[PDB]
Symmetry: C6
Subunit: 29 residues, 6 copies
């Protein structure tokens, strides 16, 4: 459903957010 599809997109963006925060952590180190 349309709900599920949007939640999938939300998950995708959160994965990218996680990735960028890992990059930030690495840079600060």
């Amino acid at each position: 459903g349309e709900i599920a599809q949007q939640l999938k997109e939300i998950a995708k963006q959160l994965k990218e957010i996680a990735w960028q925060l890992k990059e930030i952590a690495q840079q600060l180190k």
Copy 2:
């Protein structure tokens, strides 16, 4: 409908959050 539309907006804002975090990461690099 309405729930899907709000989830779409949530996904849009998360995409912008991901973008800004990438900018921050790039600046630290």
Copy 3:
């Protein structure tokens, strides 16, 4: 519905988060 109303509030806060991260990026630059 009540679900939709809370999702709308969630979207609002995510927009503010996006805005503040843009401000942070600008400050680091």
Copy 4:
């Protein structure tokens, strides 16, 4: 009911996230 209550709590935490990011931005400024 219960879904609305959890979304309300999600909105509350996102508001706190927005607040803390504003604090970080203000500190960088």
Copy 5:
């Protein structure tokens, strides 16, 4: 329900995110 249980976990993680951002703000100060 299963939806409610996952939203509860989402709220929990957002609370931790809020806490860590407060810690970050305190450290920058």
Copy 6:
């Protein structure tokens, strides 16, 4: 089912976000 599974993935990514923010906080400390 499918909505629960996507919310589970959303919770998983938020847990990773919380973890990375803790790393950032620890680095600032």
